């Protein structure tokens, strides 16, 4: 979901290794430290790339994920382990969150929704309504799957015409 | 009401992520801090957070306590400035903040003096007093702001002023 | 600068104390993470009870560009007001001066004078060729008041010096 | 004070040959009568009268009921219009009353700025903000009055008044 926090990648693993083999690795590891923060196993789960030597680990907490960090460099069978936050992490969560303002009221949810899918899929989104009444606010918010989007989106629907209202589009913040 | 959410305070643009323990030790350690706690633990109970629409709900052990923390209102947390407000379940005691309006024209109506008062937010309630007798207006009038904070606003921006060749008299009726 | 390290605080409490003022800050600073690394960011608060006003200085330029998100905030039920020192400058050095053209022969003290001329120095240095320690010809100065620059460039700037029209302008 | 003479009240201008009895008699069903009082009992514990300078002195259970009765001032009793007063020895905590003052013509000097402010009462603090480079003012003060009543008089006669070819701004600095 928004694990983006919760996944570390990891390069120049040694050949052969196993999912199992890695995902004791890094428990044992967290362990040794007192990198833990509860009972049980750290990593939720291992996913390697056997081709390109490299692998994502899935931890089951934020911070652990963020203690994992300190095992850069770390030795695994003999090799040197490259320890780096994914790419899609976001040490800044939310920061891409839209903010969409001066919607007509007659708009609905999905109406609104096309609206914004022009530019691509959505990994959230909401408009609000009167806890009372149901009806629309005429302003909503919404965050793209793929974050660089928010850019191409505010581009092209900020400022836009409907009915008579002036959307404002922008980052929620 | 008119005597419930008295502990308990609306906050939004919370922090995206943010945990609702980790809310509550904020806010606790700012009213330390700040010096709003008036007794030995902790003012804040509990944090009811609502993650789709990024807001939260406080509840405090005590109605002055909870009074008190409407000064954080703007605060910054992570990087986020925390909108405090009264949960809408709430209202005070009516006549609260009633106003008094002083150095009206007499020949102006209801709507006339009321259009200058409602530019700045709608009213809950309001009178011009006339002369039963002839209905022509005495130049004074009542009233108050259904959201209370406007009430500084039209004592702000009114009271003092010019309006004719009188100056307007506008404050709370007490 | 230093006056990067500073900050202007008013609307304190009557009655509070340099002690007091610096704990709650160092406090303040930790609880928002807004702390560059350990111990405390606060090391020293001036007080004037008369005007209520105060300053803090903190170790570090950016701890401090930290500290202004606490503008509004309550401090013993009163709300402080965080804000820049007057001699602030967001550019670190954009009123350094460029002494050039100054005649060969002249040293620090000599070259030095003349500048105080429209007022005390922050900073000072005469360029000389590392070996022979002779002067190149030109200097660069700033004044602690910022707001002589101008006028010094206008006393300056075409002077003649001797056998030469001096050239002062900001080295920016 | 700081913080003696909370509990007591000066009565002046008392009936003559009335008793202590029959004061706190009166005031303490005062307080009922005008929902003064904060809990069940007296909020009067004793009265001290002096005959021979006709005045005498209220002893309250609380602090917060002293308060209260201050409300009492000019209540007619047996005919007389009584004066409640607090205790000499009585101080409010500094700052409580302080003032500020905008919209001065900047070429004033602290006696001139003074002279508009005593003409209410005595000031017991006063301060004119000047740029310390120049020693100039910024035409806006600060200051209180010895006397805490002469606060609302200086306000009401200067707040929202003309000097010049400005208008001023007196209210409490809070």
Same mark, same amino acid.
Not at 153 to 156: E, P
């Given at each position: 979901p928004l694990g983006s926090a919760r996944r570390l990648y990891v390069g120049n693993i040694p050949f052969g290794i196993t999912e199992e083999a890695m995902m004791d690795f890094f428990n044992a590891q967290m362990r040794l430290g007192g990198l833990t923060q509860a009972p049980g196993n750290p990593v939720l789960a291992v996913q390697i790339n056997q081709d390109k030597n490299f692998a994502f680990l899935e931890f089951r907490s934020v911070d652990e994920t963020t203690q994992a960090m300190a095992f850069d460099g770390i030795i695994f069978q003999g090799q040197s382990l490259k320890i780096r936050r994914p790419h899609d992490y976001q040490p800044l969560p939310g920061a891409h969150k839209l903010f969409i303002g001066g919607l007509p009221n007659y708009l609905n949810d999905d109406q609104v929704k096309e609206l914004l899918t022009s530019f691509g899929p959505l990994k959230a989104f909401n408009l609000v309504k009167d806890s009372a009444t149901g009806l629309s606010? +005429?302003?909503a918010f919404c965050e793209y799957v793929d974050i660089n989007?928010?850019?191409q989106?505010?581009? +092209?629907l900020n400022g836009m015409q409907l009915g008579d209202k002036k959307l404002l589009v922008?980052?929620?913040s």
């Open positions: 606010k +005429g302003y989007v928010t850019d989106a505010i581009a +092209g922008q980052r929620a």
